[PDB]
C-alpha cells in the first residue's frame, strides 16, 4: 500500500493504518485484510458499511480516533473484535443488527453516562465487554440477556451506585467481573447466582455494612480466593488475591466478609 503498512503472516493479513492523519478510510487496501488498525487518526464519524468490501476482516481498531458517531449501516458477518476505546462516544453504538459474529467489544474510556434498554440485542456471540472508565451510574434491566456466552465484563472505574439484581442471569460461562473503583454500596441478594466466578474485582467501593450486606458477606466467605486487587501494568496471573480489599465504608477498613450482622434483622426490643 502506498500509506498503510501490510504485514503477511502465513494466511493472516494485518494492515497498519495507525497515526497517518487519516480523515477517511484509505481506498486501496488489500481485499484480503484480516485485521485493520486505524488507531490515532481523526475519524469523527465512521461508517461501518465502508468496510463491506473486506470479506475476511475479523478485527478492527478505531481507538483514539476522536470518534463521535459510528454509523451502523450494512453488515459485517465475520467481524469478531471491535475496539472503540478512548474516543468521544456519548452513547453506545447499537451494533446487534450489524455485527452478528462479534465476540469482543471494547468501549472503555468514552463518555458514556448510561446504556439504553436493549443496547446489546443481537450480539449473541459476545464473549467480552469492556466499559472501563466511562460515567455509568447504573445498567438497564436485561442488559446481558442477549449475551449468554459472556466470559469477561469490565465496569471498572465508572461511578456505579446500583446494579440490577438479575444482571448476571443465565451467564453460564462468566469468568471475570471487574467492578472496582465505582460508588457501589450494596449487592442484591442472589446477585452472583450459582455459577463459579474465578475472578472478581470489588475493591474501591463504599460498601454499606448493614443487614442487607449479609448476602455479600456470605458470598465473600465462600469465594475468598476468587477476589482480587487490580494492579496496572501487569498480567492478571501476577495479581494478588485479597478478600479483605472489599471494605465497609465509614469503618477504617473493616472487611465486608467479616461483617457480624449481630441483631439482624433489626427489630424492636
Amino acid at each position: 500500500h502506498p500509506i498503510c503498512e501490510v504485514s503477511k503472516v502465513a494466511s493472516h493479513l494485518e494492515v497498519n493504518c495507525d497515526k497517518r492523519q487519516l480523515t477517511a478510510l484509505p481506498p486501496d487496501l488489500p481485499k484480503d485484510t484480516t485485521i485493520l488498525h486505524l488507531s490515532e487518526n481523526l475519524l469523527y464519524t465512521f461508517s461501518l458499511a465502508t468496510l463491506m468490501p473486506y470479506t475476511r476482516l475479523t478485527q478492527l481498531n478505531l481507538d483514539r480516533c476522536e470518534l463521535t458517531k459510528l454509523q451502523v449501516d450494512g453488515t459485517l458477518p465475520v467481524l469478531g473484535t471491535l475496539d472503540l476505546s478512548h474516543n468521544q462516544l456519548q452513547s453506545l453504538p447499537l451494533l446487534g443488527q450489524t455485527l452478528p459474529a462479534l465476540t469482543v467489544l471494547d468501549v472503555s474510556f468514552n463518555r458514556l453516562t448510561s446504556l439504553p434498554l436493549g443496547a446489546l440485542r443481537g450480539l449473541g456471540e459476545l464473549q467480552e465487554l469492556y466499559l472501563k472508565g466511562n460515567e455509568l451510574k447504573t445498567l438497564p434491566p436485561g442488559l446481558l440477556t442477549p449475551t449468554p456466552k459472556l466470559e469477561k465484563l469490565s465496569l471498572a472505574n465508572n461511578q456505579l451506585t446500583e446494579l440490577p439484581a438479575g444482571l448476571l442471569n443465565g451467564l453460564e460461562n462468566l469468568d471475570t467481573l471487574l467492578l472496582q473503583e465505582n460508588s457501589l454500596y450494596t449487592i442484591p441478594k442472589g446477585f452472583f447466582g450459582s455459577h463459579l466466578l474465578p475472578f472478581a474485582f470489588l475493591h474501591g467501593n463504599p460498601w454499606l455494612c448493614n443487614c442487607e450486606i449479609l448476602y455479600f458477606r456470605r458470598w465473600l466467605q465462600d469465594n475468598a480466593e476468587n477476589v482480587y486487587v487490580w494492579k496496572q501494568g501487569v498480567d492478571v496471573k501476577a495479581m494478588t488475591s485479597n478478600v479483605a480489599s472489599v471494605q465497609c465504608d465509614n469503618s477504617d477498613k473493616f472487611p465486608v466478609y467479616k461483617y457480624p450482622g449481630k441483631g439482624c434483622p433489626l427489630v424492636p426490643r
Binding site: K152, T176, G233, V234, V236
Partner: peptide
C-alpha cells in the same frame, strides 16, 4: 498495556 491484554496475560 490494556485491561484486555492484562486479562489475557499479554502485557
Amino acid at each position: 498495556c490494556t485491561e484486555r491484554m492484562a486479562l489475557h496475560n499479554l502485557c
